[model samples]
Target: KLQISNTCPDKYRTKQEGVEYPTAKKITYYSKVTETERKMNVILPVGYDENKKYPVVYYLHGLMSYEDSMLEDDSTLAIPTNLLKEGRAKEMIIVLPDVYAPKPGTAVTPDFNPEYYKGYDNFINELIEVIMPYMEEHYSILTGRENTALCGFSMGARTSLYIGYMRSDLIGYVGAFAPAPGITPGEGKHEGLISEDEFRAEIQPIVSLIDCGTNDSVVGQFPKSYHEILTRNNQEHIWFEVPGADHDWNAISAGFYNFIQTTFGALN
Candidate 1:
């Protein structure tokens, strides 16, 4: 049984960009270790029903953006709604979380250190340990890995890819748009991919959609390195090259729409 208080929104707020996406609800879930209370906005399909379970798509925002930034934008939500409304994609429980705190002195996403918050690990801990469990208990979501997908852009893309690698058993599909590889053995706290051997050991058969813009100076050929590594390790994935696109939302929006509509065996 779903608890109305925990699973359902205590209140719903309308956004300026897309008001018709009324089923979106804000949720509050806390972490025991970090003593952190995080807020996530869940955008459900219109005419959503509780009687049926839906595949969940957890999409994270980029380095320069907040969780609600993309969700609140006029065009971002437009695709998902249109996809569901037109039967291009199956209904899904889409969620976006506020991964930003204040500043790295500039931006926030649990890949930092302040003695109070320990970057990447802290974010993943809260996400899987706290958030996922709460959603499982309350929402009408399938628990299997194949029933869940993770997608993000830039920093969020990096996070999604890393999380998928770290916890391949937990998430089934990963959609990374312009993610740059970060965290090395000696320099960072995340031993996320300690070495090629470890990475190969963990790589499993899963759906990973990775892409980057050809003319994206902001995020250049790093994606090629990632793709090559995955290829060498025989990792099953797809790499789409966006022709003449830049490292901007306009480029990613369509990629995201196509990825969302295609993955999780939803449209197949």
Candidate 2:
């Protein structure tokens, strides 16, 4: 069990003097799922050595958000960089993938149509086939489930949970921050991706961290429902609510801060 502050510490929120932070580099890969060129943001640790392999975190963005959505916020990078500089978190590779897996002539515009929603689910195949292979071939990333983590915000969170449950053998850690509705059958356009009983896993994660804001209007109570469902299914996980947070970065940073530290230190 771990105790985490509801809000991220100021040291991670702001840049410290004389500490060098890694920049996110945009990289492209061909996705057979979409059959088009896709882009992602990769943040390498400072003084990255090809000989030394590092753990990899695949971060997905919220609905209608892009690969650069999370990194565009300085704290997203600042949190990890500050931790590395202070030796509070292990040095690792962070990847921001474009969660929207749209095919050619499809509605690439950020809308809430059912067709666009399918792309989010389709990303599971993309991550496994295209993105994972690309990273393994080009980067010095540690392989196996223990070294891999899947995390996301809102719709991305929903997808992460979906992928984690669907392919529990592929990832060791699953973090859902302000997870949106629709993982299980729900009301309205949210139709869901799977059934309630399907949430059970043959192989559970080493760390399943779930959190949402008290005042999250967009995905209100969705994260809690996931926590509850996982509970009902006899799944082991850590669940918490952010104090007075909304569907924004405050909640996102808190989840990331905790998730990164736990996964990096747990295996050691």
Candidate 3:
């Protein structure tokens, strides 16, 4: 069974006042490697039936944010709830998994270390190997690459792009909302972790969508840098710039919603 906790505030309520949607919060689970439990909140569309299979979109968050960040925002409310209701997007399972692992040797660093990036690998492994199986057994999910997608904002966007590149066989659609520049071959300590040929080969066949706000100061150059890399390598991908937006969730949530609808909606 999947373990759950209530570390965050209860953002959603049970059906009341004639509200028909099935909303849940603080749904937690344990990671196989770290042995640390994580929380994710889910919202099922109104009148959702278990007998039907649905696509799943796993939404990852930024460095300091949790799974709840994606759904808690008022701007993001329409994308998941209203879109499903209006049939603009499919009646899908939206998973907002917590990606905050604190750094090592820090008392209050929230476990976000350089090595935590590797932990992200293990975390995603545990999610797929353990948690996903449980979700499949319980909920009606379309179990295949064509029915699944990965998306995120900022740091989460970096993680989504990296993870989706490495595991495109498992994820069909990849949406990176303002991801940083493409991973250079020899920049980080983990540079030698994987070869250039492997990296090129892995990402060459996936459906990738990258978007960023035009005025994002911190990582606004990501699109230009990424385009340069893709053009030089002859890699095909989608890149967009949202005019007059910033490095905030307001832009990310809107871009993410439209990207999902445009890229993954046809799977339904």
Which regions in candidate 3 have their CA more than 4 angstroms from the true location?
A: 1-22, 101-116, 185-198, 201-206, 263-268
- Worst 10-residue lDDT window, candidate 3: 1-10
Taking all chains together, each candidate's TM-score versus the true structure is: 0.78, 0.94, 0.77
Candidate ranking under TM-score, highest first, comes to 2, 1, 3
Model 3 over residues 1-268: C-alpha lDDT tens digits? 1111111111321112444454655677765544566677765555778877787777777765577777656534445554444454666777777765432332234433355555454446655765677668767889777778888887677777666777777877787787654344432233433444444435453467777777887566765565556556675767767766687764676556565554454434
Best by TM-score: 2
Top lDDT prediction, candidate number: 2
Which regions of candidate 2 fall more than 4 Å away from where they truly are? 103-105, 266-268
For model 1, how does the per-residue alpha-carbon lDDT over 141-249 read when each residue is reduced to its tens digit? 8777788788787767767777777788888888788875552232224243446544432646357877887777765776666777778878877777777778865
RMSD in Å for candidate 2, one decimal? 1.6
Q: Is candidate 1 or candidate 3 better by TM-score?
A: 1
| Candidate 1 positional error at 155, Å | 1.0
Among residues 3 or more apart in sequence or in different chains, the pairs in candidate 1 whose N, CA or C atoms overlap within 3 Å are 110-119, 110-120, 112-119
Residue-level lDDT tens digits of model 2 in 136-216: 999999988888999999989988999988888998899999988889977546666778888868998988989898999
Candidate 2 residue pairs in backbone clash: none
Backbone atom clashes (below 3 Å) for every candidate: 3, 0, 7
Question: What is the TM-score of candidate 3?
Answer: 0.77
